Design a protein around this ligand. Structure first.
Ligand SMILES: CCCCCCCCCCCCOC(=O)c1ccc2[nH]cnc2c1
Lengths: 226, 230
């Protein structure tokens, strides 16, 4: 309740006001393979969500009560899933319009060189997500359920499960006020999309036009199970 | 050249004769669920990779001079070229007009049976097989070209001058033969398509390691890790 209110406040504070939106670089008709500028932009757009998602998670009630190690581990493990889910929800797949958490608005063709195919899969997911007409409260719970989840190497797993359970109840409680099971149905498809992001970074690291910035690199390495 | 004879012997010994082709697992049509794979598809993918390295190892030991390079230079050349060699040899021996992959053991598998294990990569390899086939490279030239892919400059060679020496020798053996029967610049034009296909193979292994239905065999894994510049 106060939980839901807290989760909603943290969500809306973590993104641009419809008025803080910037179309000054938006182009509805532009025209090759990726160059260094496309790869820089890809890393820059990813990097732009790092501090924002960190500050969002600190405002999730209970999140600061977890061990610093479990905090860092949860953030690293969900970063990509969180970037995708939040971009999918904020974006306008009907116009092929990507809206980033800084307020930057770009057409798919303007990011497509950097992201590759993954951008199309993300837009497919955005359309699927948009179709379920998820309200902000539900999404504020969903996004937190993506963060506060079991990962390998948690010190206090029981406490993470506890807090997940609490957020899950706050969500069910709100939805009652199969629809739940279709919301929760989008967490595994989000993990599959996470995989494509790891594939793309792998590929970009191979190609090495521009190296990933240290923090993305660490997320990449620390999130490989092998 | 006695070298060319040696190079041809090693090439022809390193694959099936048109008689020892094995259709015991071939199915002209299977109905796969695409974009996914089971443990059986992934084990076979690794087994086909594994089997090609063992055959390519034995082929390279038959290249005159190759056995007298340092053990370290031998391993480094084999690792560095393995994927290019697997692709080039598979492209050359395969029948893309019948959608037929032919492996160095003699095993024949339809495009659709390889789709689950290999993904897209198998289709790009068939595109390359067609491109390669259309250049009408004879066995002697290909026996030299495959060796030139192996015996080449790489970072971390202990005796690079000796590798260049042996490269030079195999290069002359090739020129001498192309003049004898009488496309080279045209062959070199398809070297980026091959480099891309090497990238696609690293992408596929990456993905399969992520997925981890079955672990990669140690030797393929070491080639994967040692072959990533980072
Ligand atoms: C159909 C495209 C290529 C088929 C084989 C012809 C090329 C022979 C080997 C490459 C050129 C001579 O050797 C090299 O300098 C060399 C060797 C291995 C390489 N791997 C990637 N680039 C390479 C270049």
């Amino acid at each position: 309740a106060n939980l839901l209110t807290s989760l909603v406040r943290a969500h809306l504070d973590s993104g641009p006001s419809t008025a803080k939106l910037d179309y000054s670089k938006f182009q509805e008709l532009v025209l090759g393979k990726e160059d260094a500028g496309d790869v820089q932009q890809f890393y820059d757009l990813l990097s732009g969500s790092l501090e924002v998602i960190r500050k969002w998670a600190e405002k999730i009630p209970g999140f600061a009560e977890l061990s610093p190690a479990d905090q860092d581990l949860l953030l690293e493990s969900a970063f990509l899933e969180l970037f995708i889910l939040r971009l999918a929800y904020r974006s306008k797949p009907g116009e092929g319009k990507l809206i980033f958490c800084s307020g930057l608005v770009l057409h798919r063709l303007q990011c497509a060189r950097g992201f590759g195919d993954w951008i199309d899969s993300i837009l497919a997911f955005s359309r699927s997500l948009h179709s379920l007409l998820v309200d902000v409260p539900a999404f504020a719970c969903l996004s937190a359920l993506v963060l506060i989840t079991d990962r390998h190497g948690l010190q206090e797993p029981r406490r993470v499960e506890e807090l997940q359970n609490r957020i899950a109840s706050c969500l069910k409680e709100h939805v009652a006020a199969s629809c739940l099971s279709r919301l929760l149905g989008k967490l595994p498809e989000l993990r599959t999309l996470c995989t494509q992001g790891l594939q793309r970074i792998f590929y970009l690291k191979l190609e090495d036009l521009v190296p990933p910035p240290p923090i993305i690199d660490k997320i990449f390495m620390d999130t490989l199970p092998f």
